[PDB]
């Protein structure tokens, strides 16, 4: 299972680290907040005036856990793995 600090791919295409795992104000269920290696994201750890974590702008992404996979494992559009 995913833990804060894990190295992951989002959507099989973007590598980063789990910075946040929990409930949010923008959707149901548990979401993974990932800080990407590259500026391919859409936030800095906040959405709509709730902050979930802090990273550099353009490096943050949130995804449901079903879209986040640990590096080294199959993730399921061309994908890294």
From Swiss-Prot:
It is found in: Cytoplasm; Cytoplasm, Cytoskeleton; Cytoplasmic vesicle membrane; Cell projection, Ruffle. It comes from the Eukaryota. Residues 22-64 form the CAP-Gly domain. Phosphorylated. Phosphorylation induces conformational changes by increasing the affinity of the N-terminus for C-terminus, resulting in inhibition of its function thus decreasing its binding to microtubules and DCTN1. Exhibits a folded, autoinhibited conformation when phosphorylated and an open conformation when dephosphorylated with increased binding affinity to microtubules and DCTN1. Phosphorylation regulates its recruitment to tyrosinated microtubules and the recruitment of vesicular cargo to microtubules in neurons. Detected in dendritic cells (at protein level). Highly expressed in the Reed-Sternberg cells of Hodgkin disease. Binds to the plus end of microtubules and regulates the dynamics of the microtubule cytoskeleton. Promotes microtubule growth and microtubule bundling. Links cytoplasmic vesicles to microtubules and thereby plays an important role in intracellular vesicle trafficking. Plays a role macropinocytosis and endosome trafficking. Interacts with MTOR; phosphorylates and regulates CLIP1. Interacts (via CAP-Gly domains) with tubulin. Interacts with SLAIN2. Interacts (via zinc finger) with DCTN1. Interacts with TUBA1B, MAPRE1 and MAPRE3. Binds preferentially to tyrosinated microtubules, and only marginally to detyrosinated microtubules. Intramolecular interaction between the zinc finger domain and the CAP-Gly domains may inhibit interaction with tubulin. This is CAP-Gly domain-containing linker protein 1. The chain holds residues 211 to 300 of 1438 of the full protein.
């Amino acid at each position: 299972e995913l833990k804060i600090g894990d190295r992951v791919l989002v959507g099989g295409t973007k590598a980063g680290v789990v910075r946040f795992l929990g409930e949010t104000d923008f959707a149901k269920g548990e979401w993974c907040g990932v800080e990407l290696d590259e500026p391919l994201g859409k936030n800095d750890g906040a959405v709509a005036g709730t902050r979930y974590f802090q990273c550099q702008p353009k490096y943050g992404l949130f995804a449901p856990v079903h879209k986040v996979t640990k590096i080294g494992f199959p993730s399921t559009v061309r994908r890294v793995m």
